[PDB]
């Protein structure tokens, strides 16, 4: 059947596209003490497991396509989902937009695995200290809220502060013109929909989306001072479907702006 031949073609194409393997992080007592290393090791293990599962499933599909392997119930269900264009349930272990088809999912998985491979290489080259200074895309991670919590824990442990007394400040600056302080963590890929951010100041704009060059998350002691009237709280959704709420950022609107207009127009930060 021609469907079998074209499924062979697309399976081979994806097997070429997806990276080969992922390297687990090396455990160490000092690394175990570090929370960022723990979070990144969990992410690496999850990514490696999912990558191995997907690669083995694609290899089994290819072997069936040659006729060398018979379609078991799991393999038959996978083939049916592939032909119908629906995302297999086994593959989807991280949160994914509902309408995303298989090809886009494979592309996203490839990008995430590339990011994880770079992260593992950087960690192996240095350690947790280098792991602190890695600019990581929140959308690429499987659980970005875990990353936010990990940064909070790292800042609390470095300065011997308590977790509940720390608050988050966002500094949106260019990647080249950025300062990596002790409490500052870089994040890329955030996109602001409904507004433009210049000099950490929000301005209303008609553009559909303005890409934030580099967002610096800084954990600071609770000043216990009321937020100014120009301070606006913007949600950070994981994808464009706006079903996942990672956290909330606080920005300073420009003068002559109205925060109610910001609320009405649905201005929000998106991970991807």
């Amino acid at each position: 059947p021609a469907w079998m031949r074209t499924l062979h073609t697309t399976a081979s194409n994806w097997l070429h596209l997806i990276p080969q393997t992922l390297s687990h992080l090396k455990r160490t007592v000092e690394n175990i003490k570090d929370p960022l290393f723990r979070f990144f090791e969990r992410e690496v293990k999850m990514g490696a497991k999912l990558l191995q599962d997907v690669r083995q499933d694609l290899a089994d599909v290819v072997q069936v396509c040659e006729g060398k392997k018979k379609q078991t119930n799991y393999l038959r269900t996978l083939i049916n989902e592939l032909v119908k264009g629906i995302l297999p349930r086994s593959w989807s272990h991280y949160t994914v937009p509902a309408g995303m088809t298989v090809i886009q999912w494979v592309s996203d998985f490839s990008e995430r695995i590339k990011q994880l491979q770079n992260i593992s290489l950087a960690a192996a080259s240095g350690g947790a200290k280098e792991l602190k200074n890695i600019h990581v895309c929140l959308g690429g991670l499987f659980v970005p809220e875990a990353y936010i919590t990990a940064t909070r824990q790292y800042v609390a442990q470095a300065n011997s502060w308590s977790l509940e007394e720390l608050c988050l400040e966002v500094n949106v600056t260019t990647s080249q013109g950025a300062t990596l302080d002790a409490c500052s963590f870089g994040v890329t890929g955030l996109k602001l929909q409904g507004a433009t951010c210049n000099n950490n100041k929000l301005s209303l704009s008609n553009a559909i989306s303005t890409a934030l060059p580099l967002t610096q998350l800084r954990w600071v002691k609770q000043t216990n001072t009321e937020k100014k009237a120009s301070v606006v709280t913007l949600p950070v959704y994981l994808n464009f479907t706006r079903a996942d709420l990672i956290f909330t950022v606080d920005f300073e609107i420009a003068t002559k702006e109205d925060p109610r207009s910001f609320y009405e127009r649905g201005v929000a930060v998106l991970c991807t």
Binding site: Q193, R242, R260, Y263, E264
Partner: protein
Amino acid sequence: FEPPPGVKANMLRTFSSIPVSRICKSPNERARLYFLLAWFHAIIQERLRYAPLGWSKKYEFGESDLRSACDTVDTWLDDTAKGRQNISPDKIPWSALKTLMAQSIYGGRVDNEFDQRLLNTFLERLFTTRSFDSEFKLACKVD
């Protein structure tokens, strides 16, 4: 059969659905309130079509919620204005309407905190004594 899109069409359907006698009661201001309610309802429903942007999910802001809001307005206006032909716009129980239509009606389906914030913004913009002036703007810089 589908409802014709358009704030004008939505308001016309809302006004046709409500009996004419109810909107014309002892307080002459009551009709004004109803109009505002209709407008607000229309706006809310017309933000459903832009689901990712106007809201976070396709809520069921159906006719039942509109009927509940009309009943709430009726009861609170009757309690505040006990058979008075005219009532001052300040004396209108604005806070009761805003709170009830932010938490009980139109807010029971709202689970996202930011959707609740948007609903509160809309209610505080529309339902106020300042609406009873001829300078009130139902919308700003439309075109």
